[PDB]
RNA sequence: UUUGCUCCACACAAUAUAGAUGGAUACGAAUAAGGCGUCCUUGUGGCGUCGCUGAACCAUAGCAGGCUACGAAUUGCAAUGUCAUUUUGCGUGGGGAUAAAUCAUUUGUAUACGACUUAGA
RNA sequence: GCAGUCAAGCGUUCAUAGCGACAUUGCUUUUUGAUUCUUCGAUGUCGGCUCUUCCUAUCAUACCGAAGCAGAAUUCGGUAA
RNA sequence: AGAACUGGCGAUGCGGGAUGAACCGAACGUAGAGUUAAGGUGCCGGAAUACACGCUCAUCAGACACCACAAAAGGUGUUAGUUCAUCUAGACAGCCGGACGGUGGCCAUGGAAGUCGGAAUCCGCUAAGGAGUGUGUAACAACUCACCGGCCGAAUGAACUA
RNA sequence: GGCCAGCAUCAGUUUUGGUGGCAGGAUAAAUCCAUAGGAAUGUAGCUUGCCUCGGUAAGUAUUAUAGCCUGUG
């Protein structure tokens, strides 16, 4: 219900996140995918790298600047898998694809704003333990993405700075959890435990 | 040799007499006891007091609670109603916060409108009496 | 089919601990500190004794028992590499050209280097791994020794010395040379 | 499939010469009383000289269970037509009733041998009375003394499509 | 010749809606494993509790919410009940800034023409 | 066209280091034979010069394996356009 | 290329088979509602990221009959099953001990006790060990081992089917 | 004095809920109660190596300081 939904994408399946985003962004929910380099995808590495070197081959053989534009970033791979699932040739598809932004890592527009997680698309809920997954960052670097070191440095420099925010918040939280847990014994709270809250 | 730190997980094992809870179906949300297993996926449940009959149900409908009480294999409804009351399971269950939270969650959707507004009045006093004291 | 449980157990000798959590197994024993990650096989360890430790897989479907037995024997070998170690004794064979193997202290590793192998003039380079202790034999002048803690290093280094001494486009059943592992003994026996 | 184990009695029509032909009995597994009779007249037609218009279905009776709250070690015998050559088989079920064992007979028979319901004859469904004669490993691994096992990876069912926190799967 | 032109103001009027009417409420990582709290011989620690739905958490008392410290009936049995927000013009008062490019002409490191490249108070 | 399946016998008594019959089975459109579906109010017809891209059933180059493989050249195949 | 019977297409739109003259459903005045047919319900795309039992992980998987192709033959890759079966009087294994003396039983002889080889075959000790299964010395040696025995107390070898 | 909306009582075609009455069935089967019989995936007591009071074991015994099934009412 929040108008800009920040879907975290650590260990989501690619197709199962693409479908539940392409249905949600067709109805107006401005969805921004964040950390789309940690996306996972079914099957092993040497099957999906083959299914991408079976896709780089397809190009217009009278002028190569016309046919399938093989975007090789792990943002734009999910973007291709969403462009397949909406009808981007129409105008409803264009005004629905404008409602979606896809990032690798976390840019500081979306630093301190809440990440939500799609439950029906998670790897830990949708694979069998024992099958082989594939990290999309591990795939795109093999197929020609030059931007792993920049995103890894720019992301863990964010994580080490975020941990001290969490250390401040965990100190602030037990102030309230010490004030109220020494003040919940009163009749103001016993008049509410008869009301459920 | 000095002590070894070996730990993986502390499961709630489906065993004989495991107090299990129906989560889906017509009689969902009332306690039951696993009498004996049948296959990998379906067990035989029998809960006398809570109202459920003696059935053979999937493990998909059921939810294993951590509290267990003893019984022999293949127990009938009479013997499990004896062991149930003698082990006092329906009293031991409500002491867990899971039952406390499930009763609170039952109560909140059972509130009427004036009982919601008195909550709205009473939630203007707790923080008003607490949040001045932290300075 | 689906199983319910099969189990193996690891039997620790005197002096060694096993500190395991989240499928990283560990040994701090009388000689070494072997940390070995196991982060892709969904095994479950549980301590029954200070002398032996249960390691059991549940149902799985018989593609898991082949994992449970090898993950038992992996920790068995990882323990016995610290209790008694491994010691591979390799030996030169040469028909006419006397082989020269020595070490060098390069700016990378301690690069063990072999030359004069069937009269070749390219001086070959082999790196050493970390725990692999390399030494010579001063009773027979044709024998070298690898030792250490982890089997996937102390045998892999003998593999790296026995891979590159490969005869190219001549008969292997006529020109039989190279260095060969003979005695896979232990470091205390 | 909600099966219902039926008991059917059939007889030839009474001839003026012999007005007492023998009543034949079958106890079959069928979904209702119509395919009950139509699977009766297909089984009896393989054995004796009678068609549907030459005999009368004397009696239909459902056979409710003798104890429907008891785990029984069923040993079912069966024959089935493959895509090349018909075969005899003997499976092992461990369900609670004869009505609910033949369903999971048909399900895993159609799963492991791809035989549909039109190719299978259920021969004999016998509750094995003890633990000695049963020799199927997928039951001898279930009947063990004081068996415990855990369910290691319990996934969560979901109701909404935006979980605000990372899921826990621990059971 | 502050006729010009832009920056702040609310002053008016007008303009486009991919569709705001309580709150996008921030650790990270593993899921056959974790979070939070206590204690210590600060650990892959001894101990306790917890998840089994965010159905949560915060705010919501007053002319869509006023004076002081009563006020809103008779928008008549429903008739959006407008308050959104990126733009722009015109007028008022308050500061600020004092240029470039193109053609023509020339050059040959360029050239079909356009273009590129230089030179000229 | 031979890519696969059974391979008498031969290569000095030495069945698949290889080859060669009896003969079974299924590819290929690149031949020709077949029918006559598309223009008989015309799709310009062979061959060469020129020029680009593609296929693999590899002639050479790369890396291997196995060869009654001393070397050397051969010969037998595998990945590979 | 030529007949037989029915239905169709020609003359015929509509919902389904991605589009397709013949297939599937159905035949049509204009309108509103409900219900379905055939077909489907991740998303494009109206509709269960519904339930239940199984099997597969393919370095060219597989997904709606007509249909837009797939064989003969092979793979302990997995799964279920059939029928003999050695064998708790310790099977096969896995580590370990013996393989003995009667007797070099006879021919090829330049040199062959079992062994470049050939016509060929009885007994003691027993717990068991073949004039003998190969390596070998020009020959005698020395191993191997089906045959038993020490340990094991677990069973399992074998062909075949879908 | 019309048109356009709202609500109520009707009528037709529906579509979606909660509850009751009656019958049929092995006059449902079950569970429940009573008796007999039996067995092990053996519940107490009893020989049995210290430990922790039968715990270790596997014999003994078939309802005892748990219970199970079969046959009947």
TL;DR of this structure?
Chain A: This is Large ribosomal subunit protein uL13B. The structure is cut from a larger assembly and holds chains A (197 residues), B (135 residues), C (189 residues) and D (171 residues). With 197 residues, chain A is of the alpha/beta class.
Structure description:
The structure is cut from a larger assembly and holds chains A (197 residues), B (135 residues), C (189 residues) and D (171 residues). With 197 residues, chain A is an alpha/beta fold. Chain A has eight helices and six strands; from the N terminus they run βαββαααββαβααα. Chain B has a domain of 83 residues: SH3 type barrels (Roll). Chain B contains five helices and five strands; from the N terminus they run βββββααααα. In chain B, a hairpin with a 4-residue loop joins strand 2 and strand 3. Chain B is extended, with a radius of gyration of 21 Å. The termini of chain B are far apart. Chain C has a four-stranded antiparallel beta sheet with strand order 10-11-6-12. Chain C has a three-stranded antiparallel beta sheet with strand order 1-5-4, with helices on one face. Chain C folds into two domains: 85 residues, Outer Surface Protein A, domain 3 (Alpha-Beta Complex), CATH 3.90.930; 104 residues, Alpha-Beta Complex (Outer Surface Protein A, domain 3), CATH 3.90.930. The longest helix of chain C is centred in the middle third of the chain and has 19 residues. By secondary structure, chain D is α+β, with helices and mostly antiparallel strands. In chain D, strands 2-1-3 form a three-stranded antiparallel beta sheet. In chain D, strands 5-4-6 form a three-stranded antiparallel beta sheet, with helices on one face. In chain D, a hairpin with a 4-residue loop joins strand 4 and strand 5. In chain D, 17% of the residues are buried. Classes of the chains: A alpha/beta (197), B alpha+beta (135), C alpha+beta (189), D alpha+beta (171). At the B-D interface, loops of B face loops of D.
């Amino acid at each position: 219900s929040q108008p800009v939904v920040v879907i975290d994408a650590k260990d989501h399946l690619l197709g199962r996140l693409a479908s539940t985003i392409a249905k949600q962004v067709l109805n107006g929910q401005k969805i921004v995918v964040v950390r789309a380099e940690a996306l996972n995808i079914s099957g092993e590495f040497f099957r999906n790298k083959l299914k991408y070197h079976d896709f780089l081959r397809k190009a217009t053989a009278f002028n190569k600047t016309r046919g399938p534009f093989h975007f090789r970033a792990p943002s734009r791979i999910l973007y291709k898998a969403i462009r397949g699932m909406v009808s981007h040739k129409t105008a409803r598809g264009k005004a629905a694809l404008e409602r979606l932004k896809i990032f690798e890592g976390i840019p500081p527009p979306y630093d301190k704003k809440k990440r939500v997680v799609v439950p029906q698309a998670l790897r830990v809920l949708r694979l069998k333990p024992g099958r082989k997954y594939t990290t999309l960052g591990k795939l795109s670097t093999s197929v020609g993405w030059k931007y792993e070191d920049v995103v890894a440095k720019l992301e863990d420099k964010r994580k080490v700075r975020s941990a001290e925010y969490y250390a401040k918040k965990r100190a602030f939280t037990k102030k309230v959890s010490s004030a109220s847990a020494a003040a919940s014994e009163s009749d103001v709270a016993k008049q509410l435990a008869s009301f459920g809250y | 040799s000095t002590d070894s730190i070996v730990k993986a997980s502390n499961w709630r094992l489906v065993e004989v007499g495991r107090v299990v809870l129906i989560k889906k179906g017509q009689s969902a949300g009332k306690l039951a006891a696993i009498v004996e297993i049948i296959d990998q996926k379906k067990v035989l449940i029998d809960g006398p007091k809570a109202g459920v009959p003696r059935q053979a149900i999937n493990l998909g409908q059921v939810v294993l609670t951590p509290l267990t009480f003893a019984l022999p294999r293949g127990a009938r409804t009479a013997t499990v109603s004896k062991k149930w009351a003698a082990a006092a399971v329906c009293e031991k269950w409500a002491a867990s916060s899971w039952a406390k939270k499930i009763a609170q969650r039952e109560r909140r959707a059972a509130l009427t409108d004036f009982e919601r507004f008195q909550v709205m009045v009473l939630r203007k006093q707790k923080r008003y009496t607490v949040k001045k004291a932290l300075a | 089919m689906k199983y319910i449980q099969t189990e193996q157990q690891i039997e620790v000798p005197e002096g060694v601990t096993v500190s395991i959590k989240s499928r990283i197994v560990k040994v701090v024993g009388p000689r070494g500190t072997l940390t070995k990650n196991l982060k892709h096989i969904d095994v479950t360890f549980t301590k029954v004794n200070n002398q032996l430790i249960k390691v059991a897989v549940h149902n799985g479907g018989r593609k898991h028992v082949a994992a449970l037995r090898t993950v038992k024997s992996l920790v068995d070998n990882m323990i016995t590499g610290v209790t008694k170690g491994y010691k591979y004794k390799m030996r030169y064979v040469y028909a006419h050209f006397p082989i020269n193997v020595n070490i060098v202290e390069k700016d990378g590793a301690k690069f063990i280097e072999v030359r004069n192998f069937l009269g070749d003039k390219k001086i070959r380079n082999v790196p050493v791994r970390d725990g692999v202790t390399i030494e010579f034999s001063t009773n027979v002048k044709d024998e070298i020794v690898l030792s250490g803690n982890s089997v996937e290093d102390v045998s892999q280094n003998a593999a790296d010395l026995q891979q590159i001494c490969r005869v190219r486009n001549k008969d292997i059943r006529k020109f039989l040379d190279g260095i060969y592992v003979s005695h896979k003994g232990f470091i205390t026996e | 499939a909600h099966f219902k184990e039926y008991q059917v009695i059939g007889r030839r029509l009474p001839t003026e010469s012999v007005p007492e032909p023998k009543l034949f009995r079958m106890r079959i597994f069928a979904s209702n009383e119509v395919i009950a009779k139509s699977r009766y007249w297909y089984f009896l037609q393989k054995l004796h000289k009678v068609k549907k218009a030459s005999g009368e279905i004397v009696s239909i009776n459902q056979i409710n269970e003798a104890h429907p709250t008891k785990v029984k070690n069923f040993g079912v015998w069966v024959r089935y037509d493959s895509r090349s050559g018909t075969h005899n088989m003997y499976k092992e079920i461990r369900d609670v009733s004869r009505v609910a064992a033949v369903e999971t007979l048909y399900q895993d028979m159609a799963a492991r041998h791809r035989a549909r319901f039109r190719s299978i004859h259920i021969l004999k469904v016998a509750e094995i009375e003890k633990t000695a004669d049963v020799k199927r490993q997928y039951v001898k691994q279930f009947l063990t003394k004081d068996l415990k096992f855990p369910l290691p990876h319990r996934v969560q069912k979901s109701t909404k499509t935006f979980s605000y926190k990372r899921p826990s799967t621990f059971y």
